[model samples]
Structure formats: structure tokens, C-alpha cells
Target: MAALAAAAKKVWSARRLLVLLFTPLALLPVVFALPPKEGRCLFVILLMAVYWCTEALPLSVTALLPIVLFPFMGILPSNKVCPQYFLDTNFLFLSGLIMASAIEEWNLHRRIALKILMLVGVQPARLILGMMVTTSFLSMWLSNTASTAMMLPIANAILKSLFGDSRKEDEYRRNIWKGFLISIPYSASIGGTATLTGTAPNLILLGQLKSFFPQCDVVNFGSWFIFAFPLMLLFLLAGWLWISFLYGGLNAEDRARAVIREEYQNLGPIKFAEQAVFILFCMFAILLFTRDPKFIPGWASLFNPGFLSDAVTGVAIVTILFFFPSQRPSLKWWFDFKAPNTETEPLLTWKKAQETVPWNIILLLGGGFAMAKGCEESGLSVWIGGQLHPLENVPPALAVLLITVVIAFFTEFASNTATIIIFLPVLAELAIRLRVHPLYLMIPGTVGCSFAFMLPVSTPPNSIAFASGHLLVKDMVRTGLLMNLMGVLLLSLAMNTWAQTIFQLGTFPDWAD
Candidate 1:
């Protein structure tokens, strides 16, 4: 049976590759038939899209194709294109990841998760809510994959402890178990949408906006949080309620509560290291929020214009952590004012940061940045915008609804980052053509990238949850389909209502031109 399963996996992998290889070839005629520069640019975009969707190659590797192809095809010079792979946004993302890494290195995230679970109480319905809240909150700072990965074991342990080893044989108990497991990934994805550094697609949108519309300075970390945080909260409450209603009916007895209490007890006291990391994490968020303070004058305004960017703030905070000693002696020497012969350690190290940061994602963002630039230079964006002129007749709100629905479902089969890279540039152009604010279309599309709830293959969190053997594909589809629809409706409504007031989406901003 094991051998057969391995063979089947191999066959499936090969089939995915075949799809990737043929997709570009099938589109060659259409790609070649377009205008010279647009044709070449479009061909690369389609090829990258295929490779990105199918995982025919490593995403970072596919991202690098533009460097070679752009120069060779004369779409853009190598000097201009190569730098897109390492921009300020890239550093901003890197700094955030490093901070998250330090938190993970010290088990601060685990400690926080357990603490929240204990506080929420161990009632079965409350347990699922606790898990969702914990996972969601962590994902706002950490990678969704990392957040989900950390929570899964704890969730599994709780499930096993509650239902015993024979849960598979009991239908009534199994439904509740499935709901608890599914909530981890669902909340992870939803929580990630709340913050800029929370997910790759969010950063991709930022990069694209700066690349395409630098004058539109309205969308920053603070602005994004103010807009999307509320949306995330709403989704979390709705998702938890939906999951609890469906499967949280099985009352968790004392055994489950004991399991949670035991886990919290095992963590012992919150040491100085955890406290230091937590302080830094809190500081990081406060700085991000106040750096571009919306309601009042920000600290950035105190500095010379352009001196205090999000990247600068991120680097400044992370740099301090590298020098601040995690453990220092209680007694200070009057002579040297330093601990003698003690092995002092900084809060984070170069080696640890290198290991923890997701370089592949950095490269992926760079590639998307490069792609957006190529689209602008090659006139593909303009041409695509012209093609979408019919949308000018459609109501802006309705157009937002249509775009959100398409991206929400398309992302179910493609890389969310890749989807944003391919679509955002076109949407930016479309906004101009339609005489509306670029964000009217682009923001919804960006948020829609995270709405990939219908398939396990849609996201790392979903795949992680499905791997636990507690869920069937059909089970995910049934729940995820509803979640997808809810996301579409909620996102469209927010765009036309709450988001409009915050972003001033009623009028076309002068910057878009």
C-alpha cells in the first residue's frame, strides 16, 4: 500500500508538470499574434502564470525568468529590471519576517497561543474560538504557514485528548473534530489579510502600487490596517460562528479542559526573554501604526520628508534587537560595568535570521515587482486597460463586485502572489480608463487574493490542515464554497461602503492620472 501511494504521488507530480509545459505552447499563437512588445511581454506573463499556478518550477525560479527574458526580448534593459528584485518594499518585508523569526526562535508565539487558549476557557465551542483567535492574531505578524503549523499540533493534541484514539470510528465525535482543525487554516488566511506584513499578496499590492502609482501615497501600513482590520474582525466572528454552529455542539468534558490547562502549565512562567520579544513585537506594531498616523500628525512628519519610510522604521527596530542582549547578569561590575567572562547573546543572530526568513517569498515579490514594471514599459498595462473600456459603462461598484468574484475564485487555482502580479497592473490601468480611483479596483483585487478557501491546494494553511487526515476534500469544498461566497459579498460591500469612506473612494483621486 505504501509503495502504491508513493507511485501515485509521482504520477500526479508528473501530470502537473505536463500541464505547465503545454499551457504556454497552447497560448503561443495568441501570444505571437499581439503587437511586438506586448506579445513578448504577454507571453512571459502567461508562461509565468502557468509555472506559478502549477508549481512546475520553484516560484522564485519562475520569478527570475523576467530578468533573462525581458532583456533578451528587448522589453526592458537588464540594468533597470534587475533592481526591481531588491527594492525598499523587499527590505520592509524582510525586516518584518526577521522580527517574527526572533519571536518563533524563543517560543514566544507558542507561549502566547497557549495563554490565549487557557484564557478563552476549554468549553468545546470556546476552544474552537480560542484557536481561531490565537491563530488569527499570530498570523497578523508571523507567516500564515508558520502560524497554522504551530497551532495544528496543539489543536490535534486537544482533539486526541478529548475524543480518545477511536475518534475515526465515531461519526458524531468526528464532525466536531473536523471543525476544530479547519478553523486553524481558515483563521490564519483571514488574519493575514489584516496587516501589510501579514501575507505576501499584501506586500505585492504595495509594491505594485508604488511602482505604478507612486503619487497615490494614501495606502500605507496604517491606512491598510484601519481599512482591513475591521474586515478581518468581521470575517473572524462570522467564520467562528459558522464553524461552531456546524460542529461545536459536542460538549467538551473536563478532559479537554485539563489538556489545555496542562499545556499552559507546562509552559511555566513567562521569562524575561519572552517579555523582551513581546515588547519588541508590540513596539513594532505601534511604530507602524503611528509612523503614518492618519488621525493626527505622525512621527514621520517630525522628520524630513522621505526620511522615515516604513522600511526605515522596520530596519531601525530590527537592528536594535540584534545588539540588545537577551540575557544579562543581575549584578553589574563597578569596574567594567559589564558581566565578566559571561557568554552574552543578542536577542537575534544573523544565522538564525538567515534560516528563518523566507527568501523564496522575497524573490517572489521581486519577480512580481519586475513583472509590474515590464507591463508598464511594454504598454501591456495600457493596452489591457483599453481592452477593458467596456467596464467604463459598468457601475464602479458592480465592477468591483465582478472583479472580486473573479479573483476570489481564480486564486483558488493560482498562487495568490502571482494572481496579484498579473492582475493589479491591469486593474490600475483599468481604474484610469474608467476615471475612478485606482484603489477602487486594485484594493478589492488584492484582498480577493486571500479568499482562496475552497481548495486545500489554494493555500499553505489549507494544505497543512488537510494533511492531518481529519478532513475529506468534500468536507473542505462544502465549507470553503460558502466561505468564498461570503468573502466576495463582504469584500464588495466593504469596498462600496466602509472602505469608500476611509479611502475616499467616492471620487477619482488626482494622483491616479
Candidate 2:
């Protein structure tokens, strides 16, 4: 039996490699047969898409294909293509990641998460709500993967304490455990939609918009929050209610509360480091929100037109941490010549930041940016738009709905960031061809990127939840399918109503042209 199992695993691995090796080769005839430059561009795009979807290569490695192929294939010069990987938007993402790393380094994220959970108390329904709310809130500022990872151990502790031993629990108790675990990932995914730095796809949307239509200023951080935060909150409430209805029960209430209380007590009081990091986190959010205020003149307006950007603001705020002290040196350390005075110890260290930052995500973003540029340069974007021109006859709202539905499900099996990267350029062209504001399609498409909920393979958060051993594949599918439908419905409504009002989406904007 053991030998057979080993053989089966070997076959499965070989099958994956075969698929990776042969799929692109199979497309070579069609790729070479098309118009010269465009064919080569499309070939690279398709190759990256296949590799991204199949995990045949690391997503970042696949992203590098544009750098190599664009220069060699005559689609773009290396000078033009390489710079896309490190634009201002890339710096914005990098600075935000640095701050997040500091928070993690000081254990500040965990403290904030536990406090939120404690404040919500521990009734089965409220506990689920608390976990969802906390996860979602953290996700708004931190990466969804980091937020979910930070919260999962707390969740597991609660479950272990509440049920004691899994073997001792009845089927009803198991259902409740499944629901609680599932909500962490779902909330993390949804919460990330509320802010610009919440997830890679959100940043992808921002970067693509700036790259594709540099004149459109309607979708800044403040404006995005105004439009998306409400929708995210609504989704969170709806998701919590749905999960509670489906899996929650009255049994185990007392034990759950007791476990929460114990956990909260175990954390003790917040430390000075926690307080400092929390304050910095709040300051970071305030800077982003105020930089592009919608109702009144913003701080950025006071500067020269090109002098200030979100990336600059982000870097400015995060740089302060390098001078702010997190701890005082001991007397002996101060006496040592090698040890700098206590005043020199900054809140964030280079070593810790290097260890904590998600360089893979940064690389992935660069790749996406490079590909979007290639599409534009090779005229592939224009070609794609022309192909999609037939859809102009479709009502814009219905068009958005269809696009939303397709991306929401497509994201389930692909990297949401890569999925958006591949589609946003096409959607941008489609909007131009349709003579409608690009935001009408782009906003819905970007939001749809975060709605991947059905499979363990859908996102890092979902996979984290699944690894807890409480959730089965069938459980995630049944629950996630319903949430997916709900997301589609909500996104369509927002685009046609609220989002339209915010972006003035009823007619084409001059800037889009």
C-alpha cells in the first residue's frame, strides 16, 4: 500500500510537469501564425497566464517572462519594460509593507487583534462576528494573508479550549468550529477590499488605472474608501449572519466565553512597544485618508501639482519610524563602545524589515505592471479592445455584471493579482471602445478580484483556514458558492448605483479618452 501510494504521488507530480512543459508548446503554431509582433506579445501573455494559473512556475518567476521576452521578441525595449517594475505605485506598496513589517516585528498586530476579539465578547454569534470584524479590520491595513495568519492561531486556541478534545465533541459542535474557521478567511478577503493597501489586487487596480489612464484622478485612496468601505462593511455583516445562521448553535456558549476570557487574560496589558506601533498604524491610515480628501481641499493641493503623491506620503510617514525609539538601552549596553546610545535604537530595524516584507508580492506587482505596459506597447491592448467592441451593444450595467461574475469565479482558480493584471488592460480598452467611463467596468472588475471564496486554492487566506483541519472541501464549496453569488449581486448593485454616483459613471469621462 505504501509503495502504491508513493507511485501515485510520483505520477501526479509528473503529470503536472508534463502539463507545464507541453501546454505552451501546443500553442506555438497559433502564436507564430498570427501577425508578427502582436502574436509574440500574445504568446508571452498566454504563457504567463497558463503558468500563473497552473503553479507550473512560481508566480514571480512567471512574471519575469515579460522582462526577458519583451526585450528579446521586439515587443518592447528593456529600457521601457524594466522601469515598469519600479514605478511610484510600486514604492507605495513597498512603504506600506515596511510599516506592516514593523508592526509584526513588535507583535503589535497580534495585540490589536486580541483586543478586538475580547471587546466583542464571546457568545457564539458575537464571537464569530468579533473574529470576522477583527480579521477584516486588520486586513484593511495589513495584507490579507498576514491578517488571516495572525488570527488563525488565536482562533485555534479558542477552539481547543472551548471543545477541549475534538473526539469529545458532538456533530453540532463540529459544525460550529467549521463555521468559525471559515469566517476568518472570508472576512480577511472581504475586509481587504475596503482600502488601497489591503491586498495586491487593489494595488494592481490602482497601478493599472494610472498606467492606462493617467489623467483620471477620481479613484484616489480617500475616494476608494468612500466607495468601497461601505460595501466591505455590508459584505462583512452579511457573511457573519450567513455563517451564524448555517452553523451556529446555542450549545458551547459558556465554554467559548470562558476560553476567550482566559486567552484575553493571558495576553495581560499592552506594552509600550504595542502602544507606539498602534499609534503609528493610526497615523499611517490618517495620512492616507487625508492626503486626498474628497469634500474639502486636500493637503496635496497645497504642493506643486506633481510634487505630492500617495507614494510620497507613505514613504514620509514610514520613514519617521527609523528615528523613533522603540526601547531604551540598558546601562551596561550604553557603557559598551560597540553599542550605540539608547537614543539610536529605532522602532524598526533593517534586518527585521528584510525578514518580514513580502518580496514575492512586490515582484508579482512589477511583473503585472510590465505586462500591462507590453500590452499597450505591442498594440495588443487595442486589438483586445476591438475584439471586445461587439459587447458595446450590451447594456453597460449588464456588461459589468457579466464581467464581475466571470472574474469572481475565475479568481477562484488563479492568482487574483495575476487575474486582474491579465484582465484590467482588456477591460480598460473595452471601456474606451464602449465610450463609457472606464471606472464603470474597472471598479467592478477590481472588486471581483477579492471575491474568490470557494476553494482552498482560491487564496492564501482560504488555504490557511483549510489547513486548520476543521474544514472539508465540500464545506468550503457549499458556503463559498453562496458567498460568491452574494458578492456578484452586491458588486453589480454598487457599480450601477453608489459607485456610479461617486465616479460620475453615467457618461464617458474626457480623461478616459
Candidate 3:
């Protein structure tokens, strides 16, 4: 009760004021619009929705409402509601990021990125594809914003060389610049779709599935990789082709290749730390991927059921790095293969991990979990799901198409995590009501949020790209608008065809019952 009102004014200054003051009064209509139980939860949700969308408060701080509001309103007791913040997925998200921080700390990410650019060499098409692939691959394990943050500087430097200090005044030069700049952030988002922990929305999907359907024994990292990797790959291909001609029709006449070559040269050789991180990164992914590929029994099955999970493996691998020695063994050090690493430290430092923790995201994710829990307990998901009878007779294909188109456009305006959290639960209820398999609705709702390409304020990756000054909002819109359509179509086609085979979407499962 007091915390929200208290935090509202604090941190000394005015980061956000008007939106904060307006929302509580603005959402007063919600209380009278529904019954007591539903009204209380809806009021909290509606307020949080606006808070999340408008930045009425910092999203994490606002997420604190459920702890205060839930118990006060009698929607859920304090202890139960508090636990929604720390699902296995949240832990997985955390541990993966700790490794990313390690990767970023030693500049290992740069080595991986520059090495790929060096190999791809320098043509406009080849450069864009290599850049896209690097960010995409990095993002599959790293946060989209992190990958973009790391990747943008290198892209900027290369582009700077292409345009030259003398400055090329031609439209041809401008188009190529726009294409390369947009590729940095845009690819991070598309690549994020390929893995379970790749983006917040991806984790939100897995978390929601497990929470809403207890019988959901599948849909972990490996299964998600099997499905999403293909979709993410094709979507990126569609994106790469569109941007190539839309912006880049020809290779630059400058020493952009020299820039790539020189940067790789400047990096010298793979040092001991980079080598350590690279090996661990690969192992982490391999363990997660092979954990349960669904064709054979996974490593977890070798143990008793429920004893292990991807999060267990995630933290296990990362924990070793903290204790492991930072430098190579002395025998390897003296050999012909030896590289320079004079200092001895742990592979990862607590100082770095402490600074790198995604505190805002943890709380923000917790807030969404609270809302989902509230939605189920207060009967809001059911109520919202019940209201969809108008589409009762619409073919599922038509409904899937219509839903994705709306979600994609809506995503361009809001954060993906917020977008999917609101929609996924309601879609779950709708699937039950419609007697259609939930995957048909839920997959689009989950994956479709990645379509936020148009606006600067959309996703953080998009925001970062826009911040660079090379990309104007108008140019972002031109590329982003069409990407939205292609995204919708690919997602739509998948739900109707491949998603059916993958998730067995045709048969309504017993879990919904």
C-alpha cells in the first residue's frame, strides 16, 4: 500500500512523474466494472498494463504491486504469490546471463563477432549476413539487448569506414548504411526466437505453458530449438533478402574488408580467457540441446523423473567457472601452442556477476507471473476467454492468421514480455472454450511478439538501433513494416502446418480438461 506511493516520488528526482500520478485515478473505472474478486485483480492488471506500457513506474518496481496488492485484496495469500517470481525459467534466464557477462567481460564476444566477419569477408550481402548471423547466434544464448549492445559498436566502426571521413553524398551510400545499421538490432531480435532463453517472450512462453498446463512434460530447450531454429532461420533469410535490396544493392567501393581484416588483426590471437569462455559456451548449449531431444531418452531421464531440468544444467555449468582457474595449465603454457595469459584469476568474478545481474528483468518477469497467477485465480482468464464466442465458427486457420497479425502490430508498440503475458493466458482459456488445441493459439501469441521492428520504442534492440543516429524512424518503419507482414505470414503458416506436427496441435490434449 505505502511502498508504491512511497517509491513513486523517490530515487531523489523526477525520472517519471505525470504518468505515475495519472494511472491510479485513471484506473478507478476498473473496480466498478466487475465483481469484487475479478475487479481487484483486473484493477491491478489494468493499472500494471498501463504502468508497463507507459512507464508510469519502472517496470520492476511496479511489479512489486502484487506482493502488496494480492494479500491486501485477498486474491492470494502472501507466501504463495511471492514464489511466482522465481520459476525455473527465471533461474535459467539468470544463469545464462551470468555466462554472457563473463563472455562480455573478457571481450570474447568481440573475438567471435570479428572472426565471423573476417571469414565472411566483405561484400554488402556477405557482410550483412555475417553480421546478422553473429548477433543472431549470440542472442540465442545472450539477451537480445546484450547481444545488440555488444554487436553495434563493431558494426558502426565498419560502416564508418564504408561511408568514409570524406563522406559519400550519394543515396546509394545512404541505403547501404541504413541496411547495415538496421541489421545489428533487427537480427538480434529474430535470432532471439530460436532458443528457449533467447528472449523474455520465449521464456515467458515456456513458463506460461508449464504453469497453465501441469501435464506439459515437453516444450523445454531442446524441443523449442527443434521448432524455433527453422522458423528463426527462415525469418532471418526473409529479413536479410528484404534489407539487402531495400538498402544494399551493391558492395561498397571502400576498404570495409580492410576494416574487418584489421579489427581481427588488432584482436591478435585467441587468448586463454577467450578460449576458456568459448569452450564453456559451446558445452552449455550442447548440454541444454541434448538434454532431451525427444527422439531418445535425455540425460535427465537417466536420473529419476523431475530431479533435473535445463535450469539445473545451466547453473551447474556456470558454477564450475566461478571456481575454475582463469589461466591455462603450465604445460600448455610452455608448449608451441601456448598463448599469452600472465594473470591468474577465477574464470568469472563475483564483482562482474554482481554488477551484471538483470535486477529489473527479474522483478519485471515476477510481475508478469503475478498477473498470470492473478488472472487464473480471480477467474479473469476464464472470463476473458468466455467472451470470444463471436469467433466460434471462424476456421482455426483464419483465427490464427487474425491473431498473429494483431499481435505482431501490437508488439511493435509494446515490450514483447508484456505483450505475450497478457495474451497467452487468455488464449489458453480460449483454446479450451473453442475445443481447439491450445498450441494453435498459444504458439502465435508466444512467438509473434518478436515482430516489433517498426518503432524505436518497440523492443530494446530496436531502441538501441534507433539510438545510433544512422537509422531514422522513417527508415526503420519502411523496413520494419514489411518485416511485420513476413513475420505474420511465416508464423501463420507454421501454426497451420508445422506447428501441428511439432506440438500435435490438432488434438485437444487432456491437460486442458
Candidate 4:
């Protein structure tokens, strides 16, 4: 039986090998039919689409594809592949995730949320504003899903306390409760645009731009925060205000209102889980800000390191989670050398942490990387560039900006990463043709990808909000449409005015800087 089990395991492993080998083989039409350059570019785009739409792969595996495939295919030499993709930015992402995990573990997130809410103060109207601001701020540093998930439970508690258990209890009461719940998700999505690590689409844009025009001074960690954070906050506040006045009023039943204080009091002190996640998050932020000098030197350095800080932070946190005893009794046992009663065991466990980390994201990231490498190597971008020569007469800055906004709007329905993968090479190709800076268009486009809104699946935060049952499809459309427009204007204005100035692109001739 043992021998048979070992044989079965070997067969399964071999099957994976066969699939990996055959998968690339199946892509041979792309490898051969199109010119090396064009075919490669298309192949890369397709791979990215598959990953984005069908997120079942690992990020490391996706990240590793270029290193393995690029050399043999003539896109870049083997020696250059690793250094080109794996750098300080990757490490930043690693470290950031670890720190974030620590913060989540510590229950710091709840403290931060509560503190922010307290500062804003709580009225029905103020509660909406406070929730948006608090969720958005947290989402900037934490995962959108994590931020939304942490807040959702509390949102539910608030609704139950305010409206009682039945959905049919009161139409007006239900809408008010819905408004608060709905605000959490929207704030999360909008907040994710505030930093480079806020969302996956932003990261993908960063990686692709790095591949072709590593020298373009755009989309760094701190700069992205400065560029997008103000707008994110502004839009969120505006949205919340609009929602409150446009769809307001919920009279809490007298009994429910009376119990609010008691319920608040009964909610015991912060748990060990909250404390762990918070400390780690602070550490992640500290590392990201401090590691700026290694990439570009001077203030511009923050933009150069890419994902290194985040990569390091994420990996560290993930590793700690693996070894740590997740259950309270297990955690206590590790500390005290004795098991505690089951009643005292923790609600969260290591297994739970493992389950929470999005595997789909990992696979999606890997597939996207492979596709980007294939596209650049194949000359598809260059060919697309040649086709766009007629647009050379258009003002490069305006062209870049306009194109970026169009792509951003289109992605409200389609995949944001796919939109980027398809368009990045074309933008890069256009820059080389018009004899202008690639960063002009590329940066705007990358930022635009993070601005998707419309449907629930348009982005994770949207789904998070929709699932809470607070928001209607029309409600999102009406609210999100304006935000999308705001995003477009904000992107155009910020990139045109401030980006070039901060990045010091004035030195690059023919660039808008």
C-alpha cells in the first residue's frame, strides 16, 4: 500500500510536469506564426489575461517565468533577467506584507479604525464620512479585502443594533443601515488607489513599465501616495456626503437605540489577533519609507526600488504565520508549555490565516508576468507602435493622457490587468516613435488601471461592498460613474502638472516635465 501511494504521488507530480511542458507547447502558434516580436508580444498579453481572469497560479511562479523563458527566446540574456525583475521593489512588497500581517495579528487595525472614527466623531452623517475616511486610510496600507473584511463584521453589528434582525422591519430603517454597510466597501476600493501596494493592478502596471522603460521617472512608492492619496480622500468624502444627503435618514427603534451603549461596552477589550496584525503593518510601512535610497538616489529613489520592500515584508509575515500557533490554546501552550481549555482557544488560527491569503492573486500575478515578458520579446509592442505613427502629429502629452483615460473607463467592465498588458507595449512603442518620454503616457495609464469602477467584480472592493447587501446595482453605477470621471480628471491633472516636477523629468528633453 505504501509503495502504491508513493507511485501515485510520483505520477501526479509527473502529470504537473507534463502540463507545464504542454502548455507552452500549445502556445507554439503564437511563438511561430507572428513575427518573433509580434507573436511574443501577443503571447505575453494572452498569458496575462489568462492569469487575471483565472487566478489559480502562484505569484512566485508567475514572477519566475521571464527569468526562465526570456534568455532562450532572445528577449534578454539569462544573466539580465533576474536582476531586471527581482529588485528592491520586490523586497519592499515582501516586507510590507509581513508587517501588515503583524498589524492584523495585533488587532491594531481595529484600534486605528476606532481612533480615526472617534476623531471624526459619530452622527448619522458623520458616521458615513468617518467610515469612508477610516476604511480608505486603512486600505492604503492593508489589503482591500482585509480592510473590508475587518470592517464588515462591525458594520453588520451596527446594522443589527440600529435596525433589529428582520429585513422587513422598516424600509427607511433598512436603507440607512444599508448606507453605512455600503460605505465600507466603496471606501476600501477608493482607498486602494492611494499607494502602489494598495491594489494588484497598480503593481502589474509597475512591473510592465519597468520591463521596457526602467529609466522612466514615474510611479514610485511615496510619489504614488502623494499623487493619488489626496484625490482618493477627496472623492471618498464627496461620495459619502452625496450618499448621506441623497439617501439619508434611519430611525433606530427605541429599544435598539437604548442597547447601543450596552453593546458597545460588552464588546470586550482588543484581542491578541488585532495586536499582532498592527505591529507588523507599522513595521512594513517603516521599511518601505526607509528603503528609498537604494533605488534611484535622492528623493527620486523612492520611485526606483519598485516592489522590493513590499515583497520582503509580505514573505516575512507569511513565514511567521506558518510557524506560529494560531489557536489561543496552542499559542498559550507555546508560551506557557501547557494546553488551555477549548473554551479559551482563539477564534483565529494559523490555518485560518493560510486560508485568508488569496491564492487566486498569486496565480494571477505569475501568469501576468509571463505574458508581459512574452509580449516584449515578441516585438508586438514595436509593431503596434509602427501602426500608430499617424498619431505622431498629435501632442504627445495630450495623446498619452487621453488614451490613458479611455483605457481606464474601458476597464470598468474588462480586466484591469489585461487592459494594461495590451496597452503598455503600445504606449511604450508610441513613446519611442514620437521621440517623447514613455513615462508621460505609461505612468498615467498605469494609474488609470487602478481606477476601475461600475460593477461589483470590476474590483475586489466593489464585490466586498456588494456582498454586504447595502448597495444596489444602480446605486453603485450612479456613485461610481462620477468617481470614475473624477479619477480621469485627477489622473490627467496630476500627471501633467505635478508628476514631472516631482520626478525631475524637466531634464528629459521633449517630455512634458
User: Top model by TM-score, which number?
Assistant: 1
Give the RMSD in angstroms, all C-alphas superposed, for model 4.
9.2
Model 2 per-residue lDDT tens digits across residues 1-513: 999999989988787687678877876875667677778888888888888898888988888888899999999999998889877788889888998888888777777787787789777788899999999988887889998888888888887777774564577778888988999999999999998888888788887877788787778788888899989988888888889888885345577667767766776777666677778878888888888776767888888986688889889888877778776435787468996444456888888888888889898999998888888788887777767857778877778888999999999998899899888987888788888899898999899988989999999999999888889999888888989888889888878878887888887777877
Task: Residues 1-513, candidate 4: write the lDDT tens digits.
Answer: 999999989877676455555556666687677777566646545554444344324434544556655666676566655554444444444444444555565567777776666566456787678888889889887888799888877667656766554665476676777677667777887787788777766676677665665554445666666667776767777668766865555256444444444544454676665554444455545555454523345432446444344455456555554444433334455577455434443423556555445545544454454455556656676677778879888887678667877887877765665666566767777767777767677777777776666778777677877887667888778766776777777777777777676555445444332
Please provide the root mean square deviation of candidate 3 (C-alpha atoms, Å).
5.4
- The candidate with the higher TM-score, 1 or 3, is 1
Q: Cα lDDT of all candidates, in order? A: 0.87, 0.85, 0.82, 0.64
Write down the TM-score for model 2. Answer: 0.93
Find the 10 residues in a row with the least total lDDT in model 3: 8-17
Candidate 4 vs. true structure, TM-score = 0.73
| TM-score of candidate 1 versus the correct structure, residues matched by position | 0.94
What are the C-alpha RMSDs, in order, of all predicted structures? 3.2, 3.5, 5.4, 9.2
Candidate order by TM-score, highest to lowest? Answer: 1, 2, 3, 4
Give Cα distance to truth, residue 335, candidate 3, Å.
Answer: 18
Residues 1-513, candidate 3: write the lDDT tens digits: 899878865743564576678777888787788778888888888777777787767778888889988899988889988998888888888888888888888888888888888887677788899899998988887788988888888888887887672464577777777898898788998998898878888778777776778678568888788888888888998999999979888344348878777887887777887888888888999999888877778787788888788889999989977877776767656675556656779889898898987878877777778777877788877677667778688777887888888888988887888888778887787777778988778888888888889998998888888787878989989999999899888888767778677777778888877
Give me the runs in candidate 4 sitting further than 4 Å from their true place.
1-34, 47-88, 164-175, 216-219, 249-267, 270-280, 293-356, 506-513
Clashes per model (N, Cα, C within 3 A): 0, 0, 0, 61
Off by over 4 Å in 1: 1-13, 16-24, 165-169, 250-252, 329-331, 334-340
Winning model by lDDT = 1
The residue ranges of model 2 lying beyond 4 angstroms of the native Cα positions read 1-11, 165-169, 250-255, 328-344
Supply candidate 3's per-residue lDDT for 310: 88
TM-score to native of every candidate shown: 0.94, 0.93, 0.91, 0.73
